[PDB]
Amino acid sequence: MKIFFITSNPGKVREVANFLGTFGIEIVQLKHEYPEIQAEKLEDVVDFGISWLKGKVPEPFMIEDSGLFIESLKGFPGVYSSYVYRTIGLEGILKLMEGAEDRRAYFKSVIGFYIDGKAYKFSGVTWGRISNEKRGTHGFGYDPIFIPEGSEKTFAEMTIEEKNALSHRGKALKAFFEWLKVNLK
Amino acid sequence: MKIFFITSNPGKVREVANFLGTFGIEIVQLKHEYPEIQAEKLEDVVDFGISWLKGKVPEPFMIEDSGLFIESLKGFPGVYSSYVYRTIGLEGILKLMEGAEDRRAYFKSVIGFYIDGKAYKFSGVTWGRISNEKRGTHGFGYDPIFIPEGSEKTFAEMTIEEKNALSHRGKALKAFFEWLKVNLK
Ligand SMILES: O=P(O)(O)OP(=O)(O)OP(=O)(O)OC[C@H]1O[C@@H](n2cnc3c(O)ncnc32)[C@H](O)[C@@H]1O
Ligand SMILES: O=P(O)(O)OP(=O)(O)OP(=O)(O)OC[C@H]1O[C@@H](n2cnc3c(O)ncnc32)[C@H](O)[C@@H]1O
Ligand code: NA
Ligand code: NA
Secondary structure, three states: OEEEEEOOOHHHHHHHHHHHHHHOOEEEEEOOOOOOEOOOOHHHHHHHHHHHHOOOOOOOEEEEEEEEEEHHHOOOEHHHHHHHHHHOHHHHHHHHHOOOOOOEEEEEEEEEEEEOOEEEEEEEEEEEEEOOOOOOOOOOOOHHHEEEOOOOOOHHHOOHHHHHHHOHHHHHHHHHHHHHHHHOO | OEEEEEOOOHHHHHHHHHHHHHHOOEEEEEOOOOOOEOOOOHHHHHHHHHHHHOOOOOOOEEEEEEEEEEHHHOOOEHHHHHHHHHHOHHHHHHHHHOOOOOOEEEEEEEEEEEEOOEEEEEEEEEEEEEOOOOOOOOOOOOHHHEEEOOOOOOHHHOOHHHHHHHOHHHHHHHHHHHHHHHHOO
8 A cells, every 4th residue: 555755854754664564554755744733732733734735736645744752851842853953953952951960851753644535644642861972873862862761772872664663753653553554444 | 994813912912902092903813822833934824714714803903923042952942932932931041052053033924914814924134143141121032132133132121112123023014015005005
């Protein structure tokens, strides 16, 4: 089965394609910019995005919104993880966390899926902590400073398969796939 | 003349009302939430906002998008000044600026105006620097840590009239008013 993935993030595509491909699902990236509203919830961005995209792209399609939420920073950078990464970057996050007792944080991914006039959402969350040093060359974004719960390595020190087995995106993808098997034989 | 101001920020209303009121223009706040897209330019948020709002609110109306752009932080928090204020707050900005040589930054305001099926934009910019200490009880948001070029006081240490005479919003309002006098006798 083929599914179009509207996104400008090649990192997400690789991870999504590598996971669903093992089950016979082909992911095709579609660089179709769509309005990503400011909001407090990733879910809200996904809802508006799908409503705007329907009728403008091949079906069935999917989009994804995700972010890093840091407890000591009240959830920041969250929904605006991309902008924050491009401006203050990883060094800016480390700077903000200097002297922070609680370095806990979580990555969350919300996948939006549209087919036959209906939208579906699948989410995944992975808790962890912000490292004091960035390590790793894999992945993208905040991977160099995020170590998932129960691991010694940051996401950047893992391969796609390894990250997918632990990440927020992997969890959302698993829920998504399961839904596909049952609804979409 | 009456103009509806779609905004949820009472601080903006006070400043806008106090400035235009002196010229016989009555500002009425309208709490009508509208999609404020993520974007790199304040202008883009305003353009999309007006397109979404037309036909849903009384006319003529206006909206405004603004932010604080810090040079050493590559423009951050910019368009997402509101979210950043509510999360890391003023302390988060000061933390990020610790040891910063260049504390330069500017506030920018973009006013969007709609009348008779046409949208108009007016902008204003005020340069200054981020203080090391927050001072003042006036204004709102980042006012306690922003001192405009040519002044010793932060925005929070000024009155509405004083701030308006120097701020980004005051400059956008002046351009807006001038346009009103000529086009909208
Ligand atoms: O909107 P699309 O086109 O899908 O691309 P995007 O990546 O710019 O938009 P996102 O709004 O979903 O960006 C959230 C940010 O969250 C970050 N992020 C998400 N998943 C991540 C992961 O597994 N590792 C590191 N950073 C991640 C990353 O910096 C992103 O740019
Ligand atoms: O969208 P509306 O409903 O108009 O309300 P808002 O204030 O939440 O939305 P803005 O997107 O325009 O917010 C930008 C932020 O820029 C900040 N800001 C703008 N003008 C300012 C000023 O004169 N002094 C201090 N902070 C200011 C302030 O923190 C705002 O919340
Ligand atoms: Na997204
Ligand atoms: Na606004």
